[PDB]
Each structure stands twice: as structure tokens, then as C-alpha cells.
A paper describes a structure:
Three capsid types have been recognized from the nuclei of herpesvirus-infected cells: empty A-capsids, scaffolding-containing B-capsids, and DNA-filled C-capsids. A unique portal vertex exists at a 12th I5 vertex through which the genome is translocated during assembly. Here, portal proteins assemble into a dodecameric basket-like structure that is thought to seed the assembly of scaffolding proteins, in turn driving the formation of spherical procapsids composed of MCP, SCP, and triplexes. A separate protein complex, the terminase, associates with the dodecameric portal and initiates genome packaging and the concurrent autoproteolytic cleavage of the scaffold.
Ten of the 12 monomers from the basket are linked to the turret helices, each of which consists of one long helix extending toward the portal cap and connecting to two smaller helices arranged in a small helical bundle. The two non-contributing portal monomers are presumably disordered or flexible beginning at their turret sequences. In C-capsids, D-capsids, and virions, the turret helices are fully extended, whereas in A- and B-capsids, they are retracted and positioned ~65 Å lower. C-capsid portal baskets are positioned higher at the portal vertex compared to their A- and B-capsid counterparts, which has been attributed to the densely packed genome pushing the portal up against the capsid shell. Only C-capsids ultimately become infectious virions.
Numbering used by the authors:
A (entry chain P), C (entry chain R), E (entry chain T), G (entry chain V), I (entry chain N): 50 to 65, 105 to 169
B (entry chain Q), D (entry chain S), F (entry chain U), H (entry chain M), J (entry chain O): 33 to 44, 52 to 62, 103 to 154
The structure:
Amino acid sequence: VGDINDTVRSYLDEAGAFRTAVVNNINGVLEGYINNLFGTIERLRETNAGLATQLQERDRELRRATAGALERQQRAADLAA
Amino acid sequence: AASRLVRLIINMDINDTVRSYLDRQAFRTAVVNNINGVLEGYINNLFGTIERLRETNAGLATQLQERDRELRRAT
Amino acid sequence: VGDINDTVRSYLDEAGAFRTAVVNNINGVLEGYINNLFGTIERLRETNAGLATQLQERDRELRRATAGALERQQRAADLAA
Amino acid sequence: AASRLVRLIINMDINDTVRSYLDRQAFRTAVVNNINGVLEGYINNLFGTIERLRETNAGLATQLQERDRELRRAT
Amino acid sequence: VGDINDTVRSYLDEAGAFRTAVVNNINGVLEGYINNLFGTIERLRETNAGLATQLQERDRELRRATAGALERQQRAADLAA
Amino acid sequence: AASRLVRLIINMDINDTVRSYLDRQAFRTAVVNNINGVLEGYINNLFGTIERLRETNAGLATQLQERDRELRRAT
Amino acid sequence: VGDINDTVRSYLDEAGAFRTAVVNNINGVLEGYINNLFGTIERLRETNAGLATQLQERDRELRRATAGALERQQRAADLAA
Amino acid sequence: AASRLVRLIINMDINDTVRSYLDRQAFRTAVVNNINGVLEGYINNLFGTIERLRETNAGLATQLQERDRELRRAT
Amino acid sequence: VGDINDTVRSYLDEAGAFRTAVVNNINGVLEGYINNLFGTIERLRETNAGLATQLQERDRELRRATAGALERQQRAADLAA
Amino acid sequence: AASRLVRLIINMDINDTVRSYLDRQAFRTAVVNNINGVLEGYINNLFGTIERLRETNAGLATQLQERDRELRRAT
């Protein structure tokens, strides 16, 4: 959005004491975003764990599926012989 | 200082906090006038966009009603 | 609501430093109003998109209905021949 | 200035906030007294208006009950 | 509740520049009550409109019932003739 | 100016706000002492009212249970 | 309440200007407690009214019950005669 | 004034507000140090009570599970 | 956790009057932690009481079960004799 | 003061309040710059963590669709 760019340009023109205070404000918003990013990291880790679990359970069910299929084929072949 | 804001906005509430923290007489008056002019221009642009899309939505709604009524004619 | 006009009259009578301060305050409140404008613009944009997609769906349904009606009429005419 | 407030009103918590923030010694006292008197007068007028509206609503309610009773008599 | 009267008399005894600030906060509070009264007035207006529309509907049904009774009585009288 | 607020309260949150804003060294010390004594007495009287109503409620509830037991026995 | 006792001890030792401000703020918190007391006495009065109306209802039902019982006994005695 | 505080507390929120308000230079520094040490000691004691009750809860839960085990093994 | 240690290092470098204010504010934070601790204590005590009452109920039921089992065994033995 | 904070973090809201409170000109500027450097350094590290996690999510997701499609082809 152009509004933020215009505000940045206006404050840069204002600048050209203030620098240190602006940096302190950036520090405050940075620590707020530290908290936000920690929260999102935790949520994403939980999502990763859930996906991991569901994928191994899918693997286990498909391995039973293929084992049963092979057993059925073997029994049919034996009976046909 | 502006580079940090540029970084933080390329990353993605920040604008509101920055402008609130932004919130000698002659220079202050001149800067205030510049900010007011920029903001007024942006508001005028926003209102123009709003009215544009408002007539757009009105036309789309009337088109919907007309087509539905024609469909009911068809039955 | 005549309160705004009365307040304007009282402020103008009081006025005739402070002007710059009140301009700064109205600037801040304007900055606040900008976010309301943004929220409105976003919600109406989603509304516009939904209206558009509904338009195309009804377009397609009407086209299919008309095609079916024409096919039925042609079949009846062919049988009557 | 006041032109911004005029634009805001004709465009129709923003106005509430600006009037809250807007709100030597002798002039200040005189202005405060005038504001307080104007506010009190307008408050009295609003009280009168709401009293009239309440009386009208009560009368309409009683008319409603009376006519419903008449209808039940008719049946 | 007599506590407010006791507070008023105690503050009057205390008083006998501060008066101007007291009046300032007083009209601020009365401005808040102005907003409250505006809201109450609007809600009462909505209630009045609802009362009017329900009265209109009741008038319609009453007229229907009266007319119906009239033609029933007239038909009975004609049959008696 | 106090009489104006008295008229406002008798016309109908106001008390809390006016008391919060209500809150010279010797004068303020004496007035604070007086108001603290007044509030202490008022709070003691309120506590007496609380105990009165509480014992009344307890007695009424006990009578209710005893009389309900009477009713169940009689049936 | 050990924290309260120890804090009181520490404050009294520190004190022995302060007293006036402390008693002013305790005046304010007593005002808050007064508001709390108003709320609780109101709710308790409502409970009292409810209890009274239940008492009245039980009175009426017991009166009807005993009247009916006496009437049934009288009818049985009359039949037995 | 502390007597009023203790009387109010023994009469029944107040403690938290008064302690947040409560919190010669050397005297005040020493008083602050003493208060901080007292608070740290009380926090340690509270943590001790926490571990006591947690051990109690763990023991009760294990006994519960064991007794349910024998209950279901009874048949 | 490491970020906290690094911040502690930086501020120990800076500070090594402000120390007293930092101590005061840490005292306030810990006095809030006191209320947190009290809430945890109360909740865990309630949990312990509930566990104890459940224990008592289960003791009752197990005693009845054992008594019934012994009675049935004795009855069977009497019949067998 | 730092010992109390490190003890309390070893025990495991605290850091949020502490950093909100903590956050002559030359020393102030130097300490501020050091803080900025450290904070932005582990900011960049955390973004690296985010991107690696997103890559992991994409890989796991596509592996999931592949195995589900294999299941569907199995029958």
C-alpha cells in the first residue's frame, strides 16, 4: 500500500535524538513480534506432529491392505492348482 | 530507521503503532501540513474507489435480478 | 444532530499554537478512520467476488436449461413429422 | 480546523473522540460556562423530547389493548 | 440513597480555579449522558415504528373479520326471506 | 455546581464518576478525615443492613422448610 | 492473612504526609466497597422477595389441602351414619 | 492507617490494590530490600506447599488406580 | 531461554538508582505471582478433596462386593454339605 | 536484580513484563544498538526456523497425498 510508503517518506524528510527514540519504538514492536512468532512456532510444531502421526497410521493401514491382498492371491492360486 | 520499517513490512498493526508513536514550531507545522495533504489525497482516492465499486455492485445485483427473472420467464 | 455545529461555533468563538495542536489531534483521529475505511473496502471486495461467482453459476445453469428445452422441442417436431 | 469537522458531518466514535479531546483564566472560565449552559439546555430539550415519545408510545399501547379487546368482543 | 447528598455537602464545605475544572468535568459527564440519551431515543423510535406496523396489521384483520360477519348475516337474512 | 449534579441525579453511574473525580494541606487533611469517618459509619450501617436481611432470609427459609414438611406429613 | 500482617508490619515500621495520602486512597477504596455493598444488598433484597412469594404460594396450597381433607372426612362420617 | 486495612480485611481484591499502590533515600532502599527478601521467602514457602500437595495428589491417584485394578480383578 | 540470558548479560553490562527501580518492579511482578500461586493452591486442593471422596466411594463399593462374594461362597458350601 | 530473574526463569508472562519495563545519551545509544543487533540476529534465526518448518510441512503433505493415491490405486 502506498500510504505506508508516503508516511515513511514524510518522516524521512522530517529527519533530514530522534533516531534513538525511533529505534526504541522499533525495539518495542520487535519484541511484540517476538511473542507473536513464538506463538506461531508452537502452533506450527503441533500441526507438524499431527501430520506425522496421521501419515504413519496411513502407512500401517496400507501395509495391512497389501498383505491381505497378497494372502488372498496366494490362496486363490493354491486352490486353482 | 525507515529501512527497518521496510524490512518489517516486506516480512508480511505495525503501521498503526508507528504512526501513533510519530504522533521548532515552524518545522513542526510544515511537517504536519505535508502529512495532512498526503492523507487527504489518499482519503479522496479511497472514496473514489469506494464509489466505483459501489456502482459496480449495484450493476451486478441488477444483472443478477434480471437474469433470474428471465430464467423464471423461461420455465 | 446539531451538536457538531454548536461545538464548531463554540470552538470558532474561542479561537477568535492551539491551532497546530488541534490539527495534530484531528490528523491522528483521521489516521484512526483510515483503518475503518480499509476494513470496509476488504469486506465489500469479498462480497463483490461472491456476487460475481454466483452470476457465472446462474449463467451456466440458464444455458443448460435453454439447450435442453431446444433439444426437447426439436425431438418433438421430428417425431410429429 | 472546523472545516474538517464540517466535512466529517456532511460525509454522513470519531466525532466523540475529537469533541472529547477538544473539551487567560477569565476567558477560559467564560468559555467553559457558555459550553456548560448550552449543553444543559440541549439536555433539557432532549429530556422533553424523550418524554413526549414515551407518552406517545404509552398511548399507542393503550389503543392497541382497547382495540384488541373490542375485537375479542366482536368474536 | 443519601450518600450523594452527604458528599455534596462535604464538598461544599471544602470549597468554603477548582470550580472551573469541576464544571469542565461536569459538562464532559453530561456529554456522555447526551450520547446515552441519543441511543435511548433511537431505540424508542424503533419501538414506536414496530407498534405502528403491528397496529396496521391488526386493523387489516379486524376489517376482514367485520366484513365477513356482515356478509354471513346478510346471507342468513336472505335465506330466512 | 454541586446542585446541578443533584438535580441531574434526582432527574433519573453518575455517582461513581463524580466521586472518583472529587478525589490547602490542612484543609484537605481535615476534609479527608471527615469524609473517611462518614464513609466508615455508612459502611458499618450497610453491614448492619446486610446482617438484618440475611437473618430475615434464614428465618424465612427455615419456616418454608418446616411448613413444607408439615404439608408432606399432612398429605 | 500472613502476607497482610507482614506487609502491615513493614509499612508501620517504614512510616515510624504519608498518612494523608494513604487515608485518601483508603477513602477511595472504601467508596468502591460501598458500590459492592449496594450491589449485594440489592440482590439479597430480590432473593427475600422471591422467598416471600414462595411462602405465600405454599400458604395457599396448604389451606386448600387441609380444607379438602376435612371435607372428605365429613363426607365419610356422614355416609357412615 | 494500617489498622483500618486489617479491620477491613478481617471484616469480610483490597489486598492486591493496596499492595500495588504501596509499592530518607537510604531508609527506603533498605525497606525495599527487606520487602523483597520477605516476598522471596514467602514464594519459596508457597512452592514448598505446592510440592507437598503434588506429592499427595500423585499418591492418591496411584492408590486409586491400584484399588480399581483389584476391584476389576475381584470377579 | 537463551535470549533471556543474553538480555540479562547486556543489561548487566549497561548497569554494572535504576537498580532500585528494577528491584521495585520485579517485586510487583512477584507480588502478582503470589496471587497466581494462591489460585493454583486452591485449585489443587479442590482436586485433592474430589480425589479423596472418590476414594471413599470406591472403598464402599469394594467392601460390598467382597461381602457379597463371601456370602455366595458360604451359601454354596452350605448347599454342598 | 539479574539473579532474581535468572532464578525465576530457572524455575520454569515474566519476560513480557520485564522486557516491557526495561525497554547518558552515548551509553543509551550504544546499549540500544547492541540490543538491536542481538534481537535482529535471532529474529533472522527464527525466520530461518519458520521457513524450514514450512518446507517440512510441504514435504509431509505431498507424501500424504502420494500415499493416499497409492491406497486408492490399490483396490
